[PDB]
């Protein structure tokens, strides 16, 4: 009884505390302002903004789908001497969604043994076809489907910009199919004729519904398309190629070089980390990260930038991010002025459901301590347009990078032989995390 | 040298003070918030708003032109049993402006002896035809022109709602005429034939320009008009009357009963106060107030309200007035929380150019300390519509009344014989203030 | 612009205190005193006032001190709160001057507390600039060629060495038909920095 009593909200206690807080001037001012305005709007520190909002970077280059294809976009732009160019995002979006839905069916069959109310099954039914993704998932799509110029497959369809409705109708159906499968699996075996047929009818039905909101791309991966365009000089040209060849010959993409590193304090550095069951194309590559310390992570970002290439990275958006001014600084808001401080560290933040990867963006530059030191700030770009941030550009502090960013993607050839071998040895046993790990899909 | 040095802004001093203010938490929070938002929006105290925003009044009735005519409007409404009714404000506005302009010409002639750069002359040239006015000025207009239903003379003309442009063109001309008069007065005498002619041509010219933005009212003060209307019962009626008779017979206005009192701490109470040269109709009544203490002023407001009549009053709008919530409370904003306090008292505020009468409104109710005490709050109404305040209604604290209100208008018959005699004796010599006194025209 | 705006307002407010002391002899209802109480800290200014500010404070690139604060774009509210206080101080001074002399210890202290209070309230709506006039600042920028550079300089040196401003050359002329041409015209008491240059025009 004593314990339960001590754990209850005592009215005298809170009113006594109130009396005490009210006799403090800072508190009296704080609750006047905070009953009137949003804490973020009220506490944004312009004094800090003034010094941190620095758009000078001495090291510069000359959502997940945009960030993963941008470099390939640049490659084509340079390879063909165009004023402007754009790869079709919708092309990959279509197959990503179709693959995820199909993959989900497989996930359901492979877990048919567990109860419906189990952690894994319930998790599978939650968001089977969300738009998020990872870099390995991007590669799984490109290896199978290739790439195509946006001109041949644009974002014309409604659902390409407002997929929520569509996704919802698809998911409702996938939930029906999940029961139909599990039910049929109580009596029949998976490889049983009936099941195989049933699964095919489901693929059919998924594709049918999808074709209602988006057209299947105009050419198959090995089918040639003809592309007419104009270069910087107003001179016209015709390119005849297939999606796969195009991704390779013109986009210059080599699926064997990209590797992603991550700063995940929950586990030892130097070890490989694998996200269980997370994927899109059945039988595709898994989500793998080489866990590393921040110094190493920062240095790799600098090197990639010095090699004149932007850097794909996953972070916790929009933590400590001011969209209006385009600043990512964990000290931009004066929360300590109201006695609000956050001691919980990165590793804990992750384990305790406070921080995760939510979005992929691009690092297009940085400023290094030209004395004899290291990076101070990074130039970041997203695909929200000139409206977000300052003309779409963001400035990120080194500290923000260390605290609320996790993954970066580089070429294995840019890694020290020490770390490169982690991917080539074959001796490394990866730490395997659950499919619902906070270090997963990026929007 | 030492004195001038001590009176200069010293850079070390201010930076040292800054250092000290910055080590104070309340200050650090205050300058974070105040660099982001308007002090009034940031410091509005909702805790105070919660208790002060009380719309219960145990004593209730069942811009200067609207406030002065409202009672007369009510009289007609009741006398004719109408659902709705409105007196023409534009009627009085037209003659007020024409009279002021003419009066200005006289003011210029009577001060022709003083230099052009003198205090009085420069003041006269400042705003000869502003829209403001006082109660005595309202009576001067009604005694000469009478009143008419709005139906016969509405606010159709553009300038009746956006007079700024019009007023400006008029004033530019009045400034030209001022020179023309003064110049002609250097050689000729005022009553001289030439001057008299010149002044008449000026009246002509003023009227001509005015007739371009507004039509002269349709009937003369002693000319009969016929008014068709519908009463509450949908029954139609025709009234044949003149503006003067109408103001008297239907509006029930007796120009001899209204008197205005004022709480002006600069001068002894019980004394009469007169604003020199302030007027509109040449030869009309002067602006006169009987100065009295706040207790008396408050009690008179209660009595008028108990006699079922709203109270015309002049105050300093918009000091401590929240238009969005419709509250007039000098403690509604938590300025002391940022170390901002205002010790200067009423008398001083006036003498030191900090407070003056700026607007006329109406008190339509109040709440008295039902124990054995006095008024706590008043119900106030303006003519800005349901948009301002809460549906157009405001709530004013007793303290606000005492501190930022000055004048009220009552019937001499509602005054104690003691004070009534101040207006009827003939022994009282008024304290005479300059035409530019802060206790003048009300908008 | 905000750099100069901050010191202009702080100086005007301080100057006002001096104007009040120097006219303490005239009645409160006098033409000059009432005029002084009207708009002590309005945003307006003249060229000589600009020079008075630059000679004392120098100049700085906007990048180091922008128009971020609310009041830098909507100063009306702020100015109003400041003025209300300056009107209170005016009485406090005049009152204390009826018995004490200006150079009297008490007055000098009182005036300093007022400067303090003015600065405190001002620091709530705008930060004092980041560097003092003779204090070096470091400025990073990019030229037309995308090439980066770092400049280390103080506000005063910057206004001179990079902005090329020579306070001795600018003079203002005016066409004022009220007075003979060829004559010099001076606006009495109009200023911002106490002891600064006067507003002078050659008609």
Curated annotation (Swiss-Prot), chain C:
Role of this protein: The normal physiological role of the enzyme is unknown, but it is not essential for the viability of yeast cells. Has aminopeptidase activity, shortening substrate peptides sequentially by 1 amino acid. Has bleomycin hydrolase activity, which can protect the cell from the toxic effects of bleomycin. Has homocysteine-thiolactonase activity, protecting the cell against homocysteine toxicity. Acts as a repressor in the GAL4 regulatory system, but this does not require either the peptidase or nucleic acid-binding activities.
Extra remark: Present with 521 molecules/cell in log phase SD medium.
Keywords: Cytoplasm, DNA-binding, Hydrolase, Mitochondrion, Protease, Thiol protease, Transit peptide
Any GO CC annotation of this UniProt entry: mitochondrion
Family: Belongs to the peptidase C1 family.
GO annotation (BP), single: negative regulation of transcription by RNA polymerase II
Protein name: Cysteine proteinase 1, mitochondrial
Post-translational modification note: The N-terminus of isoform Cytoplasmic is blocked.
One MF annotation (Gene Ontology) recorded for this entry: aminopeptidase activity
Residues included from the entire protein: 128 to 330 of 483
Domain of life from the UniProt record: Eukaryota
Assembly and binders: Homohexamer. Binds to nucleic acids. Binds single-stranded DNA and RNA with higher affinity than double-stranded DNA.
């Amino acid at each position: 009884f004593q314990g339960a009593m001590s754990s209850s909200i005592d009215i005298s206690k809170i009113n006594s505390w109130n009396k005490e807080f009210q006799s403090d001037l800072t508190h009296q001012l704080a609750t006047t302002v905070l009953k009137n305005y949003n804490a973020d709007d009220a506490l944004l520190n312009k004094t800090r903004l003034q010094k941190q909002d620095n758009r000078v970077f001495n090291t510069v280059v000359s959502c997940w789908l945009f960030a993963a294809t941008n470099q390939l976009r640049l490659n084509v732009l340079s390879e063909l001497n165009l004023k402007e160019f754009e790869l079709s995002q919708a092309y990959l979006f279509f197959y990503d969604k179709l693959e995820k839905a199909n993959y989900f069916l497989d996930q359901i069959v492979s877990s048919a043994d567990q109860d419906i109310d189990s952690r894994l099954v319930q998790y599978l039914l939650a968001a089977p076809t969300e738009d998020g993704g990872q870099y390995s998932m991007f590669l799984n799509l490109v290896k199978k489907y290739g790439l195509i110029p946006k001109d041949l497959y644009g974002d014309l369809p409604y659902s390409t910009t407002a997929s929520r409705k569509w996704n919802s109708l698809l998911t409702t159906k996938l939930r029906e199919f999940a029961e139909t499968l599990r039910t049929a699996l109580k009596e029949r075996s998976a490889d049983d004729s009936i099941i195989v047929t049933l699964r095919e009818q489901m693929q059919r039905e998924i594709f049918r519904l999808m074709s209602l909101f988006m057209d299947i791309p105009p050419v198959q991966p090995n089918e040639q398309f003809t592309w007419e365009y104009v270069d910087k000089d107003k001179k016209i040209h015709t390119i005849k190629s297939t999606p796969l060849e195009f991704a390779s010959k013109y986009a210059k993409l080599d699926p064997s070089t990209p590797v992603s590193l991550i700063n995940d304090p929950r586990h030892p550095y130097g070890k490989l980390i694998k996200i269980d069951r997370l994927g899109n194309v059945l039988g595709g590559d898994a989500v793998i990260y080489l866990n590393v310390d921040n110094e190493t992570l920062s240095k790799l970002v600098v090197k990639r930038l010095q090699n004149n290439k932007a850097v794909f990275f996953g972070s916790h958006t929009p933590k400590f991010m001011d969209k209006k001014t385009g600043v990512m600084d964990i000290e931009l808001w004066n929360y300590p002025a109201i006695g609000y401080n956050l001691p919980q560290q990165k590793a804990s933040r992750i384990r305790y459901h406070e921080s995760l990867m939510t979005l992929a963006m691009l690092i297009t530059g940085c400023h290094v301590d030209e004395t004899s030191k290291l990076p101070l700030r990074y130039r970041v770009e997203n695909s929200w347009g000139k409206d977000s941030g300052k003309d779409g550009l963001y400035v990120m502090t080194q500290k923000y990078f260390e605290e609320y960013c996790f993954q970066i993607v580089v070429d294995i050839n840019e890694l020290p032989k020490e770390l490169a071998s982690k991917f080539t040895s074959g001796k490394e046993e990866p730490i395997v995390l659950p499919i619902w790990d906070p270090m997963g899909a990026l929007a």
